[PDB]
Design an enzyme around this catalytic site. Structure first.
Site, mmCIF file in Angstrom:
data_model
loop_
_atom_site.group_PDB
_atom_site.id
_atom_site.type_symbol
_atom_site.label_atom_id
_atom_site.label_comp_id
_atom_site.label_asym_id
_atom_site.label_seq_id
_atom_site.Cartn_x
_atom_site.Cartn_y
_atom_site.Cartn_z
ATOM 1 C CB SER A 117 43.972 82.830 40.268
ATOM 2 O OG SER A 117 45.167 83.560 40.532
ATOM 3 C CG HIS A 118 44.077 84.313 36.279
ATOM 4 N ND1 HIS A 118 44.984 83.690 37.111
ATOM 5 C CD2 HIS A 118 43.984 83.537 35.175
ATOM 6 C CE1 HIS A 118 45.434 82.594 36.527
ATOM 7 N NE2 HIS A 118 44.844 82.479 35.351
ATOM 8 C CG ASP A 281 45.028 88.524 41.563
ATOM 9 O OD1 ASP A 281 45.179 89.275 42.563
ATOM 10 O OD2 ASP A 281 45.275 87.293 41.578
ATOM 11 C CG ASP A 283 43.908 84.938 44.744
ATOM 12 O OD1 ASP A 283 44.390 85.738 43.901
ATOM 13 O OD2 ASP A 283 44.500 83.933 45.196
ATOM 14 C CG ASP A 285 47.955 86.022 44.281
ATOM 15 O OD1 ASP A 285 47.252 86.526 43.377
ATOM 16 O OD2 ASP A 285 48.428 84.862 44.214
ATOM 17 N NE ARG A 286 48.891 86.140 39.670
ATOM 18 C CZ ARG A 286 48.948 85.320 38.626
ATOM 19 N NH1 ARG A 286 48.824 85.801 37.397
ATOM 20 N NH2 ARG A 286 49.148 84.021 38.812
ATOM 21 C CE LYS A 382 52.852 85.223 43.845
ATOM 22 N NZ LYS A 382 51.507 85.558 43.303
#
Ligand SMILES: [Mg+2]
Length: 550
Positions: A117-118, A281, A283, A285-286, A382
């Site tokens: 992720s982040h 972000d 991957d 999804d944001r 997302k």
């Protein structure tokens, strides 16, 4: 040819795969012998032996250090275990929304996504392994529970030690496994194609093409922050939709990298050259949405603007809108929009599984959360880049600036001023005392009704509880999901816990036209004061300020 060998392994005890998968330091996936091997085997051992040869798994990651090494491991263990086929993005690269897309398109049993992720990338950084199931979404608690159980008592795994996969070249690679009959198949696929093809079908690429090139084109800056969405930005926004190449910054995924993280992009927008900005972000999804001069569209407002203009998106013209949803701590901006239609608004605990379930029951079309998340039932993750193309769609139809659109939204629906205070690394004992006390206070009989003056402004308690949620699909009950102080003007104070971290969400509603374009931090000050006074947070934690304000 390709031999299969059994490796006796000693099990680990901390391989609990959570909602976003197993995240550890890379020096753990490297110093700790057979750490990754053990977990990949555990995941694969949840697939029944009889169902493996006919099964396909999608594999890809966010480009971080150790990804490609990891994908190699997965292939060697998938093959030796009898998984019939892997679909792997070129060079190992697949964004998380791309993986969800591909799982659902080709009907795979699931996928393994290499991302964190982040979280920071590199040798002295993090690495994570996330398992999705056949609906393209994250593995539910029941599956991840079984993987953890298996991993803790595992004693062996199977591997093809000498098996290597050329991740660079497109097409089908095959492997003759010793004493097997059918070959192991790897399909290297273009990282972007299946996903871009989905978007092409969701949005009006003709309209967007028009918007982004020629005379008075919409000037845009899209920051992929050296993450995974990079290639997707170049292939779709630039190459296909005609946005000039310099529209795309940091769109090369690197092996080592809130409102202060896209500080780069904000400064750029702040010059006043571009009409629209966005960042993503790790991957994909944001998403963060920005307007001319750096106007900040907060995520809670963003899903509301999308909801209110949803029918300028071809997908929703055709499938209709089956419901709206947000996480409980997200502002009530969306609710104001859903209230003017005949369409349900679900309020869920934070977490994907809740959205996915409502989607799978045909009850949810659009969903968002205050943590820079927006999505739809086009997939079961997302989708940041999707949110950006929804906005561009809206911009092309509305033909107004981003800031003029919010202003019009606020004048129609009223504004939900929103902010989130994070208090990081607070002492757990103090925080838990703070929560336990606040709840005890809230639970008292003569608390509903209690008034709080700003002054001038007077807030009255309508409702106060520790948020519970019965999932209409799996039947599960989620308890202690956040303290909510709900006021009669439609404003809310929310506390959550996650050393430790306190999150204070403040949602102040204003309908007055002479109040909707004021500074959020000024309009929120009375509820923030009320929040801190009633929670005794400074007294319980020692903090005179949050760590982060969003
Ligand atoms: Mg993410």
């Amino acid at each position: 040819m390709v031999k299969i060998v059994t490796v006796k392994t000693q099990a680990y005890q901390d391989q609990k795969p959570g909602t976003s998968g197993l995240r550890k330091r890379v020096k753990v996936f490297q110093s700790s012998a057979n750490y990754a091997e053990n977990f990949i085997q555990s995941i694969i051992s949840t697939v029944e032996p009889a169902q493996r040869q006919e099964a396909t798994l999608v594999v890809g990651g966010d480009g971080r250090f150790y990804m490609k090494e990891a994908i190699q491991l997965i292939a060697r263990i998938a093959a030796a275990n009898g998984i019939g086929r892997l679909v792997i993005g070129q060079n190992g690269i697949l964004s998380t929304p791309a993986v969800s897309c591909i799982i659902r398109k080709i009907k795979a049993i699931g996928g393994i996504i290499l991302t964190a992720s982040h979280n920071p990338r590199g040798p002295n950084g993090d690495f994570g392994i996330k398992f999705n199931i056949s609906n393209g979404g994250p593995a539910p608690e029941a599956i991840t529970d079984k993987i953890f159980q298996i991993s803790k008592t595992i004693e062996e795994y199977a591997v093809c030690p000498d098996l290597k996969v050329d991740l660079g070249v497109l097409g089908k690679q095959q492997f003759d496994l010793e004493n097997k009959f059918k070959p192991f198949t790897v399909e290297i696929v273009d990282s972007v194609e299946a996903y871009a093809t989905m978007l092409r079908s969701i949005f009006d690429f003709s309209a967007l093409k028009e918007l982004l090139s020629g005379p008075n084109r919409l000037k845009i800056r899209i920051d992929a922050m050296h993450g995974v969405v990079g290639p997707y930005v170049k292939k779709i926004l630039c190459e296909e939709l005609g946005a000039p190449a310099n529209s795309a910054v940091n769109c090369v995924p690197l092996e080592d990298f809130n409102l202060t993280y896209a500080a780069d992009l904000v400064e750029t927008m702040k010059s006043g050259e571009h009409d629209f900005g966005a960042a993503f972000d790790g991957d994909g999804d944001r998403n963060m949405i920005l307007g001319k001069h750096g106007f900040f569209v907060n995520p809670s407002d963003s899903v509301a603007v999308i909801a209110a203009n949803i029918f300028s998106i071809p997908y929703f013209q055709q499938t209709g809108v089956r419901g709206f949803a947000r996480s409980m701590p997200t502002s009530g901006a969306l609710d104001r929009v859903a209230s003017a239609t005949k369409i349900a608004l679900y309020e869920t605990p934070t977490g994907w599984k809740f959205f996915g379930n409502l989607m799978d029951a045909s009850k949810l079309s659009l969903c968002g959360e205050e943590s820079f998340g927006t999505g739809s039932d086009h997939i079961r993750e997302k989708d940041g880049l999707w949110a950006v193309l929804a906005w561009l769609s809206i911009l092309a139809t509305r033909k107004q600036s981003v800031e003029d659109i919010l202003k019009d939204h606020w004048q129609k629906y009223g504004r939900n001023f929103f902010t989130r205070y994070d208090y990081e690394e607070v002492e757990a004992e103090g925080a838990n005392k703070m929560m336990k006390d606040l709840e005890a206070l809230m639970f008292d009989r003569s608390f509903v009704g209690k008034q709080f003056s700003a002054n001038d402004k007077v807030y009255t308690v309508e409702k106060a509880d520790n948020f519970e949620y019965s999932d209409p699909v799996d039947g599960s009950i989620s308890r202690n999901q956040g303290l909510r102080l709900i006021f009669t003007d439609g404003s809310r104070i929310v506390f959550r816990l996650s050393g430790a971290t306190i999150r204070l969400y403040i949602d102040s509603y204003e309908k007055d036209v002479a109040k909707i374009n004021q500074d959020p931090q000024v309009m929120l000050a009375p509820l923030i004061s009320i929040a801190l006074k009633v929670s005794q947070l400074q007294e319980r934690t020692g903090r005179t300020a949050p760590t982060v304000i969003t």
